[PDB]
Amino acid sequence: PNLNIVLTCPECKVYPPKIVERFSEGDVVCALCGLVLSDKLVDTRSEWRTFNPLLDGNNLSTRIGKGETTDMRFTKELNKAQGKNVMDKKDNEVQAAFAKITMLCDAAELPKIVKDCAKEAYKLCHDEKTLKGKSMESIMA
Amino acid sequence: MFFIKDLSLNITLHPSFFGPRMKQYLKTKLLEEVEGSCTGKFGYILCVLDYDNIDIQRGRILPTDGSAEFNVKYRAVVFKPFKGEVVDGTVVSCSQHGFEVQVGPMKVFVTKHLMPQDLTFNAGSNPPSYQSSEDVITIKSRIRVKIEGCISQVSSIHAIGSIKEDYLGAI
Amino acid sequence: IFVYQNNITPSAMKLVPSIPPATIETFNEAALVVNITHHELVPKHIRLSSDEKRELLKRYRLKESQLPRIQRADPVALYLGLKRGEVVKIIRKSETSGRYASYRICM
Amino acid sequence: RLKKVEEEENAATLQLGQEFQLKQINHQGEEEELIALNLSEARLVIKEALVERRRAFKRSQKKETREKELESIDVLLEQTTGGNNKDLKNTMQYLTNFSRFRDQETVGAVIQLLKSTGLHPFEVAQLGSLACDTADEAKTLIPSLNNKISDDELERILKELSNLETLY
Amino acid sequence: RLVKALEDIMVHYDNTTRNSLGNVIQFIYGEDGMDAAHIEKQSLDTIGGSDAAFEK
Amino acid sequence: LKEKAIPKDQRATTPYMTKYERARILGTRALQISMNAPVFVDLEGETDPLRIAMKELAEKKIPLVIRRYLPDGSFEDWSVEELIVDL
Amino acid sequence: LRMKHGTYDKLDDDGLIAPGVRVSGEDVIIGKTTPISPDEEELGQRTAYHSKRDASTPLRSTENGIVDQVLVTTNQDGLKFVKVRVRTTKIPQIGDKFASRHGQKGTIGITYRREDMPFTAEGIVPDLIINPHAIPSRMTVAHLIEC
Amino acid sequence: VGQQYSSAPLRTVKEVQFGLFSPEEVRAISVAKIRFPETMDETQTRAKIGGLNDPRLGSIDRNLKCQTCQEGMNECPGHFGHIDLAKPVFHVGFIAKIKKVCECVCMHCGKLLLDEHNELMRQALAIKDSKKRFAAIWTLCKTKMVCETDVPSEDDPTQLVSRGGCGNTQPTIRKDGLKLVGSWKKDRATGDADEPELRVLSTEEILNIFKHISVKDFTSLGFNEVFSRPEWMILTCLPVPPPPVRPSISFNESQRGEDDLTFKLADILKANISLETLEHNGAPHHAIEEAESLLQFHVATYMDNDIAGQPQALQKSGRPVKSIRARLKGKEGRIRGNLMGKRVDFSARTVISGDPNLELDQVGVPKSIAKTLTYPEVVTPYNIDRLTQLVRNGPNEHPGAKYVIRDSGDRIDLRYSKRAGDIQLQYGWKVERHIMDNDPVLFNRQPSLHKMSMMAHRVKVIPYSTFRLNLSVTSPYNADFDGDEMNLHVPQSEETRAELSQLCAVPLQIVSPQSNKPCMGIVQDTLCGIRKLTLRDTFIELDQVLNMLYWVPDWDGVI
Amino acid sequence: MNAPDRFELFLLGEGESKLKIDPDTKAPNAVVITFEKEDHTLGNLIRAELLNDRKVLFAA
Amino acid sequence: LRFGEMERDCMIAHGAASFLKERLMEASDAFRVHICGICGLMTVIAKLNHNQFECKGCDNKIDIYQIHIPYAAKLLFQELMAMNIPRLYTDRSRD
Amino acid sequence: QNAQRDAVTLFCCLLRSRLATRRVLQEYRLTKQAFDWVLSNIEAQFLRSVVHPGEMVGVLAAQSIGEPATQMTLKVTSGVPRLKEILNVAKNMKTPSLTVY
Amino acid sequence: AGRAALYKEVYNVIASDGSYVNYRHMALLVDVMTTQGGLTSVTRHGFNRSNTGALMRCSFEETVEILFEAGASAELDDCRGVSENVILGQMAPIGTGAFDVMIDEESLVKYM
Ligand SMILES: [Mg+2]
Ligand SMILES: [Zn+2]
């Protein structure tokens, strides 16, 4: 099946077609022919200009604290009731080791690059019988 | 089977055809998009009745386009492919797992399971003949088929049938 | 027509809506010490027969609910004593044409 | 509105469909009974409509022998309309192949009889579109008819229809 | 708020001032059916003066 | 039900064609004249569809009729010839 | 892949532009390329067209200056980190907005040369003329006193 | 493009009808059976796992799929899927209504407390708009926390005639948190029975007892059985919306940064599977309560995050997750910012300056703006040559075209178009061309407050980019030239051009409808000059008067 | 873009004349003339001296 | 640019309804869909290469219409259904 | 018929006041011809002066009340807050005065 | 007398300065505010909680609550409102929309 679409001018057909993008018009044109192909393009840079999941894995990270439009006692209730699913995933250990290496790397005043590389190194193996414990110090170091 | 009823149609007309003589022009348009047509609600639409004193009399200009909309009321003849009774159709084409009977307009097919198992079908026939006593598939091939059900879809009509009954397949 | 000096105990007014079609109406003298209609902000009110009301509906092509309303507990409504489903023509002294007509429904 | 399933089969024990039921109302407000048709009656009325519209075009530019008739109405059809009506060619071939009477007068006499009998319209239209002379065999063909009609009355109508119609 | 509250009021061909549901707001529009523009502050010439001056 | 319409007599709506349908019929006639529909009065070299429609109204030949909706749903009709164009 | 039509000729072998050249509206100034891996970066889901997924930075679409004083130095942690600067001349035009020291903001309507600017006996042709009606309702006496 | 013509009958919307979904309705119309909380990158590349993100629903881009209905992207409207919950849960949009109706009906019998025998509620049933009847019923049935089998004696002379089903007693429900507790005082011990059953009412039993209500009870309570049922008013099977509602923003540096609603749905499905595994295996009956409370909490949060301030329920990072109420609230949440008003096309925006050489219906437009904007024309016999010439010009000098539109949905861009002199420009086509002169166009000043400030103008193209308008029209726009800015709006068809010119044009709006005197006039400079010129003590000689007379444009030629 | 510069301020008509001779239709023997690439510095002079001549009746 | 509420309002005050509609479609969304003639929902699967318009759940292949709508309104209906709520009936049924 | 008669009372009264016969003969000195002319002009203008059916009176009124509330100012309450109270009642007093004659 | 006093009051307020608006606008505001038998402030609830179209009523900032009420009561919206016709994108029956434009074969015949 593969569901895939390749653009092709239905009146030139001479190649995988030499077309261009008119980004200020949101249109694609067969540059050899001049007929528009498809219209109303979707943005590709303002979405980035508007503002790590791969290191944290498939499971989605959540920094949950306290807000402003609620009482302090209800924020304390939120902090007490938000800790009901810290044992189902192995991601609890993943961000536990991540917090530990965050402490260690930023204690060693290392760059963010080094921090992310250590995150990757732990994430790559992260669970094996070749790991076999080793007090977490061996594998983190 | 064929039916007669008063029926309504809504038709657009391009503004280029706003000439002084358009009533018979609309009658012509009614002719070639009523005659020879198929739907699901009324099936195959055969031909028109009541050619005179037809009911159009008024039309509205569409807002965004100069097309003028018209409503047409007319008597006509259609076909209603039923289910569950006998028709003596003719077969033109055949498949390996059953013949395709053309009872008038549509092409009803009978599956190789919908033919009786005691029918002595021989695959070495041109067309493959599912004959036991007399119902040999020919150019004529008058075969008494019962429509198990003419399944209705978008305007492309299809039906299913079988001959697992006495004098079904037999005339 | 019944006029009370002061308060009515509910036991002495629970059976006011008894004996249809006879209707009983209650009034305080304090509510009746001054005629309401003689106030100059209150326009003229008149009553509609059922026939001419039906004529009105057939002319202006309304259906019975698009008229502006008037409460049952309104003072002028209680003054006239009308009940549900009646229409009051209102003549008030307009300023762009002088005299102007309008209708209400007692719903 | 409630998605209104309403499963219904079409048969001759007054088991008729909603979409084409009996009592409709026509657009002027008068009641519209269902028009079911015979095969020979349809064979007549297609010719009636064809000659009527042909004479209508004769006035427009001014201001029963089946082997000739099928090809003649065919060339009349591609005089104005298109050649796409191959299935419509199949239909009047079916009509002239299996319609119980070739002539108009036998059909007219049968309908003149049925207007006095007052039978069920779809029932007798199915009977007329069928071309058989054997009432008990017809009852074995359609058990709906077998349950509905007595064989004696079925044959007492079938023979006085069968002597009139052109046998094949 | 005000323009939201008074949107759908329409003068109709029956010279009534109706809402969307056809509820009647004015019976004849504006108590006169007269437009928004073609109006001047011209003066009535019968109110004023004396009785004697008026009859003069 | 009861035909939801009116006879041409006792039409109780003003005979003065007003501005909104002025604009509407000018726009529509402009669009047909734009799409190569048959014009109904002679031309004098003018090519603007809107001005063509303006003159065509000026000597009153518009092949349109208008339908006014009373608030109930019943409707009158009028022929654009039988209106009067003063504003 | 899907790189723009910025006509990348103004760049050089080290992917930068040189100072002192001119740039029009759509000229790119910085060249960037995706180092991923894992994307089957030149062996899959793209032809060659090697590994671009180009992240180049074009100039703002309107202005057209001259590239001046480009520097590169590593960031806080050590990367390749680039700053360029472009310089433009902005002559006054019709719509530009000037103001006094008294809240008389306004813009240029049109311009004239001397030969139809009004002129005094010594030939001091004025720079600019503002309407008198901005005086009384604004009540800006000190402007006059300053003049 | 031709938008892929379909033979479905094009009609308009005339009526719209609300309601709720029955769970069988949503299960029937759903396509997918979303079960995997992970969405994307199964191995871990593309063609995502059969959980979220199109096994069989709305595709992402450039893939035809849309559950194999092939409308690329920009015609597939999305296709719904659904999930199944372990337990029924509430609806924050109906919490208070559930409380009111559970007050209203007797549980265990499932019938109304008051039944056509108190004359007061008889006439309360009689009166109806649609819901004041319901509120009257509710406030009449606050009391009598016991259900009865035979109350009515004074309906008859004294005969006590039985109608009721159960003699049970009702609690007094206390709304609290996201759940409902009862308190059956019930007063039927050997003593006073001072034992209120502080029992949290199960969603399951509320669902069952709501299933045990009559149709005529629905009509009394103001429910439409074919569209609105109280047992439909409890969530059991939950629809999901396709990715066109909640698109992965595709973060446009290297990543996706995939969005908020899908995060919340992943949470929902995670809590769902946690609850059902905890149930299916050993259930010690002290994780069940908080697990279902968390499930109901999270679906409540996804529905709304603007609730009574006991939770806040934020994600990463400290910005709280926006729910649908936050997406639809006032000030640009989907109604005041995308339906009632919106961005448009064919518009321009500059600053303005006066000009005493444009009459009122004219406006001066820079050549740049008139080169950017356009307006289609249909090719007639009348304009064939002019449009041919104007195409032949090309899109760079001003009186030229930009696009040609053929009879089918074609747009050949004139910019690339190396056969530009070779198009013969047949009839019935559309040529999309620059603003020529005296085209009608609309004109704006924010903030518009009254009937003016949308008035129309003819266009005279001028050089030296800025707008340009006559001084007299200044005060209706309420706009001095201190740096203000206007807006342009080019109409796109003949109807709209015509009605714009015949209504919104300036010269037929001199008299202000709001205050029955003209809103125009002449202003500062010409006013001062006209008083200066009209004085008895001044005079003009021959050469000056000749030049002035020639300055008057319609001057008949007599001195 | 197409905003004109100062080249067209005084360079005589490119593919064009220097002046047009168009007859008025509102008075006997009247002509309007359209000079271009010129302005007051010629127009005022021509008008004044032509008015100084006696046989003319109107010049502006 | 922006076409806000007040601009809409004063266009209403002019009464140029066709211009207002033109500005709300062509300058913006202008999306097409198909709606079920019985459900009144937008679930219609439209294989346009084959003119097939099955509406599962309704289970009909006949009563189908295409309409024209703002895309944002389409969206608003999508999440209104996601809130478990909007039948879109193509003609009158009250009179 | 009754509504039409009662809708033009002021206008016809003014018309009668202007075109009283003593007044027209003494002051204005018309002719028969100019008298017919002024009658036709009054009729034609008045018929041009009626409300065109089909336009948004409510929006017109709303804007015509809204905009001069913007340029309005701010013992007794007045101004913006009084307008807000009387447009938003809110049965609160702040000046519950009542004049007695 | 209530609406007369109210008109007197509003005229007093808006004519303390910046007079004058025409009478008919003010009268229309008074009448639409009093045409229910009782006074009805234009609030988030006052005129908003009438038996009026759900779409215009949710164009006024009580949006999800009033849509939930509409879904629960399952009521029908007539789409004779401008806001409904806008958000459904059809031309409202307004000004130029207030009628229809009908072809005439008869006059077309008569004008060859
Ligand atoms: Mg409503
Ligand atoms: Zn090409």
Ligand SMILES: [Zn+2]
């Ligand atoms: Zn799809």
Ligand SMILES: [Zn+2]
């Ligand atoms: Zn009970």
Ligand SMILES: [Zn+2]
């Ligand atoms: Zn459906």
